[PDB]
Amino acid sequence: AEPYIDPAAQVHAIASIIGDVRIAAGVRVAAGVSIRADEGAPFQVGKESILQEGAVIHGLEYGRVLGDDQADYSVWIGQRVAITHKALIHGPAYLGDDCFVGFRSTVFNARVGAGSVIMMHALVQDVEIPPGRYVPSGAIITTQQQADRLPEVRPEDREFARHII
Amino acid sequence: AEPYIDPAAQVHAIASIIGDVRIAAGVRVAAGVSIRADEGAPFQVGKESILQEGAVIHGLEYGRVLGDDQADYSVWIGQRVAITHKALIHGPAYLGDDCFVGFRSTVFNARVGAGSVIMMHALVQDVEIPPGRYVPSGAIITTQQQADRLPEVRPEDREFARHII
Amino acid sequence: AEPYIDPAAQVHAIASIIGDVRIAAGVRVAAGVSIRADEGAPFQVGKESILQEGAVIHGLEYGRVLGDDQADYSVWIGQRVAITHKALIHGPAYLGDDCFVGFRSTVFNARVGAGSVIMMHALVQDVEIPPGRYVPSGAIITTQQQADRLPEVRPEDREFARHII
Ligand SMILES: [Cl-]
Ligand code: NI
Ligand code: NI
Ligand code: NI
């Protein structure tokens, strides 16, 4: 009912975190981020993840994903996940460790494998993305056939992700 | 100049409603919704409509649509209309009863027929959508030729809309 | 470290401007605009530019553009630039005089020539757009080959831009 905010987390005074949200050590939350586990709960945000301005994390009352701890979540965000300007993560949703979600991109009703890079103005809905895939800018990924055909992340893509954060 | 808020409406303390806005019985407005009839006015929001976080309703000084009461509006939102996360309704705009507007979708200078379902990351501009049409995720509908060719809403699409709200 | 706000600028009480931002005479900034030169700085916003609700101006710590004064900026916005609802300008970025950026459009790591019209739901990234080009609604411009092939702005496009502001 109250968020658990790790003492080593850095949450902006003007960020809004409500309900059963667990924020791990080293997570950075910018001003004008909204995390509300008032419908769908609980939410996990793993160590050293980064949420930038305009990011929103919400969830449906019904629908859960399996966390790495074998517990059920509305939203599971792994370690070192980057959720950039204006991104929307809407439960049920799973982002594995080292994922990047680019500006104005949406993840809804989906599981995103570790080390994936989702670029700008993209939608990922109703699918499982395998680990280490690249979603190009402007992509509209709404079927498992599209998700299974995504190309692999290259070193240059991770380098890009690190520069943006 | 002052909004009319029906006593049976449920408006969040942190929602911002300004100018000649009429909010009917049973309308739910989330925190971080902005409705400003400070340029284009008036706005009607019909019974049991739902506005989710990030939604914005604004309007141009000039340009109106015919409401169901035969009066002129910058924005007419019918009954049981769902305006979901980050949607932008910009007058002149008409949404008929039982319309759904999905995450990050925009309706501008357009009339949307009753019982239409507009999915995620879509734009509807400068057109009339006939009653009961479906606008797929990522669609960019900017001509009357595109609007006239949209497919019909299926029962599964309305079921989807009800689950999201 | 403190913004310079020209006494002839009109900034909403609820707009958030932070760090080394220079706002020129006649600039209008709406409520719920965010301009933060807390990572990338400095930002210039030229005379009689307009920023509408939901607009965000931010910048990367590293990466600059050449301003018209031959000084380096994270973000250079020229004179009479229109940055409309939910647009994201992310440094390093240059917008020349008389540019229009339509609803929910993004300019990142790019130079946009004077008198260009970028329409709704568009992305402009990693490119130089020549002066006086048109970017259609929904366009995803991520390569210099795409930017070099854009059509010219017509009089009707500027007329459209003036009507929106
Ligand atoms: Cl958006
Ligand atoms: Ni929600
Ligand atoms: Ni407006
Ligand atoms: Ni930024």
Numbering used by the authors:
A (entry chain A), B (entry chain A), C (entry chain A): 16 to 180
Paper text:
β-Carboxysome biogenesis is reliant on the protein CcmM as a central organizing scaffold. The full-length CcmM protein in Synechococcus elongatus PCC 7942 (Se7942) is a homotrimer of ~58-kDa subunits (SeM58). The N terminus of each M58 protomer consists of a γ-class carbonic anhydrase-like (γCAL) domain that has lost the functional motifs for CA activity, followed by three Rubisco small subunit-like (SSUL) modules connected by flexible linkers. The γCAL domains mediate M58 trimer formation.
The asymmetric unit of the crystal contained the protomer of γCAL181, while γCAL exists as a trimer in solution. Indeed, analysis using proteins, interfaces, structures and assemblies (PISA)48 indicated an extensive interface between subunits (4,180 Å2 buried at the interface from a total accessible surface of 18,860 Å2). Thus, a total of six salt bridges stabilizes the dimer of γCAL trimers. Note that γCAL198 and γCAL181 are nevertheless trimeric in solution, suggesting that the head-to-head association occurs only at high protein concentrations within the condensate or crystal. To investigate the functional relevance of this interaction, we disrupted the salt bridges by either mutating R164 to aspartate or D172 to lysine. Strikingly, both R164D and D172K mutants strongly reduced homodemixing of M58, indicating that dimer-of-trimer formation via the γCAL domains provides critical valency, presumably by increasing the local concentration of SSUL modules.
